[PDB]
Every structure is written in C-alpha cells, then in structure tokens.
Symmetry: C5
Subunit: 178 residues, 5 copies
C-alpha cells in the first residue's frame, strides 16, 4: 500500500501498453499538451502506480492501432495517418486522451475529405469564333492548344446577297480550367 513510489517512477523513457501492443517514448514527449490524460505520466503521477504492470509499462484500455498518429503528433506537432486508418477512430482517441490542439486538426481532416469529393468539376470556358467558309478549314485546324470543338453552325447557306455581306459561320469552342 504505497510506502513510496517505484524506482522508475520518473525515468526518461516510458513504456506504454496501449491496449496490448507496447509503445516506447520519452516521458518528456508526453509534456507537450499539459491538459492531456498523458500529462499525468509526464509528472510522475502516483495515481498511476496501479495501472502499471510487470514490465513497468503504463496500461491503457484503448486501441493501439489508432493511438499511433496521436503519439506521433505529440512527437513533432504534425498529423500522420496512413491511408487505411479510419480518421473517426483517431478522433475518438484524440478526445479520450484529451489533446485540444490535435482534435481541431482531426476534425479538419474529416471535413477536408467530405469536401474532397464534393465539387462541380472543371469550370469550362467557352468562346465563339466567327469566320467565312473560305477559311473554315483553316480556322478549325489552327485552333489554339487545349481548346476543343463544341459545335459550329451555319449562318446563311445558298450564295450571298450583294457585293458584300455577313461572314457565313460561327463556331463555339471550349477549354478546360483545372
């Protein structure tokens, strides 16, 4: 019944037993955000000397898989998620441990990808080129790079009017905008 704490109670290197798969990290990493459950470890908390085991690991009834990204964040202040981990189980772990900074960023991600699908795609831009027939072949083959043919449409077919008169063709052409 605690006479005093245990020889490792302040060690540099701390062993966590996050739900089964043991983790390794330096006590001081845990002192990054001083409102987290884990900040207790950082400060030698004597309430934890019954949730430590045989190896002197700290125990944690939570999911080792999801924990990683968290422990990394504490290590360098960055969000790392492999492409198969499910970000919501990262949220649930961010809350449980209580890392106010992180939780903001996870829920940023969660929107960022519910955004990522949402779009109206490729804001196409259109242009109406006009020419006579005598240069139709020309106008079509000498379009600019990237632009596509959408439609063209006659404007009067069956000889002219007088010693002058309106062009003869339109042509609408498009381009992407990625």
């Amino acid at each position: 019944s605690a006479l005093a704490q245990r020889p490792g109670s302040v060690s540099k290197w701390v062993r966590l037993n996050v739900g089964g798969t043991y983790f390794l990290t330096t006590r001081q990493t845990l002192c990054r955000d001083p409102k987290s459950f884990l900040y207790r470890l950082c400060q030698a908390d004597p309430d934890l000397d019954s949730d430590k085991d045989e190896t002197g690991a700290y125990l944690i009834d939570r999911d080792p898989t999801y924990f990683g990204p968290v422990l990394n964040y504490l290590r360098h202040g960055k969000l790392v998620i492999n492409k198969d981990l499910a970000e919501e189980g990262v949220l649930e772990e961010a809350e449980f441990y209580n890392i106010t900074s992180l939780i903001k960023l996870v829920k940023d991600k969660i929107r960022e990808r519910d955004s990522k699908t949402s779009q109206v795609p490729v804001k196409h831009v259109y242009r109406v080129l006009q020419c006579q027939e005598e240069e139709l072949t020309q106008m079509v083959s000498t379009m600019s790079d990237g632009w596509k043919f959408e439609q063209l449409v006659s404007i009067g077919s069956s000889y002219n009017y007088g010693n002058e008169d309106q062009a003869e063709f339109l042509c609408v052409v498009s381009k992407e905008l990625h």
Copy 2:
C-alpha cells in the same frame, strides 16, 4: 481481484479492463468479466484467457465495448466483423454492423446526379457575350438557329448543370 484482464485471441494478446467486458452482459465476454470458474482452464501460463477466434477482426468488437461506436479500418472486411459480433453475442453491435453492409452496398448506382437544364434565348449580336459570360457550373450542350432572315427568337440554346 484485478481491474485488468489479458486475452489471447487466436494467438495475439489483448489488454483490457474487467469493466469494458460487461458493457453488454449477455455476451460471451461477460463470463470472463465475472471471474468464472468454467473459463479457468482456458487460461494459459501467463494468465490470459484463450479464445479460438481471429483477432484481426476482434479489434472493432473491443472498441465498441469501450466507447459504443463502430470503428472499421478501410481494408477490414465488414462481413468478418459481423461473424465475430454474432459469435460473441453482442446484439446492439450486430444491428450497427448490418447497417454498414447495407450502407455501402447500395453505392453500386451508376445512377448519376440528375442534370437540370435550361433553355436560353438570345440574338446574334450578344451570342459570343452570352457564351463567355456563362455563370458558375453551367456547361454548354447545344445552340440552334430560329432562322436568320416582330422580334421572337433569333437563336435558342441549351445548357446543363450538375446537382450533386
């Protein structure tokens, strides 16, 4: 008399508290929680309880029993979850697990987001203008004459939009 319980699930070991293995008291797991003299021999030398089931699927099961949510990693197949939910007898989860299966099954739809349309009208003079100026999201499908000889039309013109 320990708060903690080790589980040898198919081979790999799992750590968790007596407290988490009784959130649903009809389950198999509940007996462990209850310090049962009928699952004593099903412990190994290091103390764990032995459980002839694949663990890679037993993950999400144990998470639910912790925070009451469903957490499935993109690659893990739901169908393998369900079997473990049903083997362990955790009805509330099974409900959730079959809702995921119906959830993502119905996504085979090649049934697209319905395009709405509009039929614009303008004269020749403001046609180039009309086209280039075109508002946000609207694509161009076709235009047509109404004869280039009382206003009525000079040109008509169709255009589409997505509505997801």
Copy 3:
C-alpha cells in the same frame, strides 16, 4: 475420453492458437493429423509446443477462419491467389471451391461492357420547349434537338433524349 483442448501453430514464423476441435472440420486435410495428435509429427514440434508449418501465415488466416465458422473472409489487401495455394497445400476441398468462385466473380468483373442506351424523339413547340427539358424525369439525359424549318401549324421542334439501361 480426453480433452487436450488447445493447440499452437507456428505457421511460417508467426504463431497461432486454435482448438483441437477446429482442426477437425475437414477430415481429409493435413490439419486433421494435428487434430488426432499424430506421432509422425512429434519432430515438427518446437520447444514452445507448437507445430511447425513451412507456409505463409499472412494467408493462413482465411484458411483457419473457414475451419472456425465455415465462411470465406478475405481482407481487401490480401490477394486471393495466395488463399488458393494455401487451400490446396492444406487440402480443404470445400474451401478450394469457394476461393475459385471469388476469382471468377471478380476477374470477370474487370471486363467492362458498354452501357446500353434507349433513345426517344420528342416534339414540342417553342413556347413549351423550356418546360419539356427542365421537367424531364430522373436519368433521362439530353442529346440533340433540331428545328423543323425555323420560321399552317405543324410542329416547331423535335428533340432526342436518352437514358442509360444499367
């Protein structure tokens, strides 16, 4: 009337625990010899008790799952071809069927057949044109439309619309 219940497998390095009884679902399979406690494999047992098996464990999961619950559970990363080979070596006829249905299921899914279309020509005068196109039922896409004279009564326009047949 003995009950030596549990047994450890050293499949390819990574251990496995499963009950004697699980390994007696297909009595024509290699694993049935482990189940009967065969003296001819006492020298394929290491120190820790387990049975040595010179095969890939990443794929031996699905195979052992079938013998627990009689179903085919395959994660999306694991390639089914590897489940087949293991299924053959261990010799689980029932399973070798199931695994070979999966492959033909999927390796004939990647064959992408053109979508069929149904096509109709409507016909609507100028006034009621706008109305026609913007009201269209679900699925029906636009295709073309043509003036029939652009200038008595008749019909003013026609129009082709179309719809997937998935």
Copy 4:
C-alpha cells in the same frame, strides 16, 4: 545442419525448412541450407540466421522458394520485391517480377478504341421507331432535316458503335 531453419530478416523472425532454401543453389540463401561455417558468426542467441534486409518484401521471395509462384499483396511495391529478389539472386524470380512490372506499367495507355459509323434514313412517320428501335450497342450521334415545309427521303441520321 538439422531440418528446420529460422531466419531473422530485418528483425522479424521467419521459419522455414532447409529444403525450401536449396531450391536455387546460386542464391545467397543456399549457404544457409548447406550449413556454412562462415555464416555462423551471423547467428544470434535464438539460433536464427541474421539478414540485414527488409522482411516486408522478403515474404514473397520466401514464398516462391516453397511453391514456385509469384504471390503479391495489393498494397506492397513490386519495385521493392524486384530489389530484394536481385540481392538474394534468384534469376527465375527476377524474371517473373520484371514481367509483373511491365505487365502493369503503361497500363494507362490504350490504342483509341476505333469507331464504325452508319447513316440511317427514314421518313416523317417511322422516325420515332428508327431511334426507339436501335440495334444493341450503337449510339446516337446526329440527325438531319432534308427540307421541311411523290415522297423521297425526309430524315438522315448518323450513328456509331464502339469496337473493343
């Protein structure tokens, strides 16, 4: 020189039988199948042989030696297999993997699925029919009036078909 042999590729143990490692006698591994006096420093406490390489990619290789097939999990990089194949020197497997890599590279590059076209003809009355009764797989492209105000043709109508 027993029967069973333990490796230790990159710090994650492998188990296999002498017999699997003699398949190719011009590969590094072959020395571990004979019982080499000069690869006995590189044994550890557990008796296993030590190998400074990456055990992710080593699996496939070791598989090929057991049953002569190139099995790969979908996520893993073939380029990493190639490289581990080469190191160990299995000329058979380097060929199989350099097949796999050519087999899927330049995947995203098809010869332009050629198109064949027709030009259907009809009159006022059967118009609706011609379109509504179109052969399997042909697509609509364009239709044309021929002078709308003793019979002749009234409507000409182009149509395509993909040739996969």
Copy 5:
C-alpha cells in the same frame, strides 16, 4: 566467468525504434556520415544511456515510417508502399538528417501532386465536304482513328457539293 561476449564485438546492431525492434548491420547506418544514425554506428558514448536492458539502442520515433529510411540506406533506393503517407516519411528523414533521402522524399511528394494530368491529350480537326448520295460512304470508309463530330447542311430547294462535315483525330 570467461573473457568476452559471443556477440559484443559485433557487426550487428539492434534498434528499439518507437517500440518495435529493428535489426541491421553497423556498416549500414554509416552510409551517410551526416545522419543521426552514424553515431550509433560508431558506438558513441553520449548514447550509452539510450540503450535498453538488451543492447538495442532506443529511438523515440515511428517505426511504420522508419522502414523506408532503413531501406534507402541498405540499397540507395526509395521504397514506399501504396498505403504509407509520403509526408510522414519526410519527417523521419528530416529528424535523422539523411540529406540525399530528403531530396528524394520531397521529389515524390511533388511527383504525384504534380500529376493533375487532365491535360487534354490533343485533337486535330478537319472539315470534309460531300454530297447527299456519297454521305453514307464518307462516314464509313473514313480513315483509321478519326472520329465523327458534327455535320452541317448547305442549301436545299450545278454539281459541286451539299454537306460539310467536321471530324476529329487524337494526337497520341
């Protein structure tokens, strides 16, 4: 009591990176004299307290990104699997200070973000002209690779012609 450890004067070096043990040879870690690792390579005294109860040196970083690092060293080539986050490697490269790696790791991060290639693979366009009678023919005896686009009528009520016809062709 004898003399020395059947395994002290050893080529082999155990790391306990973030909690999952890695094995490698002294000769491997030394590939870049500038890196953090180069020190454990050379059995540094200012690290003899980051070793554990069984000889492996300790590193507070994430193994699941380490891998690639320890590979590049072994064989001077960048390997990452399709599911690992390329960004997370950059950090583990920058912490260890492997300069040649950090030029590669970033070049891949460009390489695939630098790949919105909706870049319209080009099309050349032509304008054909044929009468009514030989209008079915043109369309079908049309050359290899060309597609149809649109066609436009020219005056229905002298031999010349009666229809234009636009037709595309891809430029792969």
